[PDB]
Amino acid sequence: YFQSMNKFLGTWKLVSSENFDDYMKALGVGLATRKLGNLAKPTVIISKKGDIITIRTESTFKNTEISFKLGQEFEETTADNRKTKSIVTLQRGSLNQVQRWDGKETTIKRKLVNGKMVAECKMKGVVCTRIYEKV
């Protein structure tokens, strides 16, 4: 008995964001960029072709896209142009992404709560919560 991330598949629209400014600060994002980041209301599209999962983020300010297999480290360029070594895992219904770069670490845990996808973003004790609804 192995679970899957099929429940994450689809198109997701940001409906709420809490503490994103301080999470961006902790990541090293500069003020002008945080201002635009805070105003962004992205769409996130999670798809899967065979073993390969893709997470595409679309906003006016920044589009990003990563493609990966579960549990295999990949190189990632983030929305704020960090170049990280990343791994996405599935832990008891939660799709967990860890990004490491320059001896630093941040985690984005995405889980489903009453049909909404909730992304918890952590960097050195700063926690940001972002809520998405399925389109």
Ligand X SMILES: CCCCCCCCCCCCCCCC(=O)O
- Structural tokens at position 32: 């002008």
SS3 55: strand
Burial of 53 (0-12, 13-18, 19+ CB in 10 A): buried
82 assigned to a ligand binding site: no
**From CA 3, how far away is CA 117, in angstroms rounded?**
17
User: From residue 50 to residue 89, what is the string marking binding to Cl ion with x (rule CB under 5 A)?
Assistant: x---------------------------------------
Our finding on whether 61 is near ligand X (CB under 6 A) is yes
By beta-carbon proximity to Cl ion, the closer residue of 55 and 123 is: 55
Residue 42's binding partner among ligand X, Cl ion, none (Cβ under 5 to 8 angstroms by kind) is ligand X
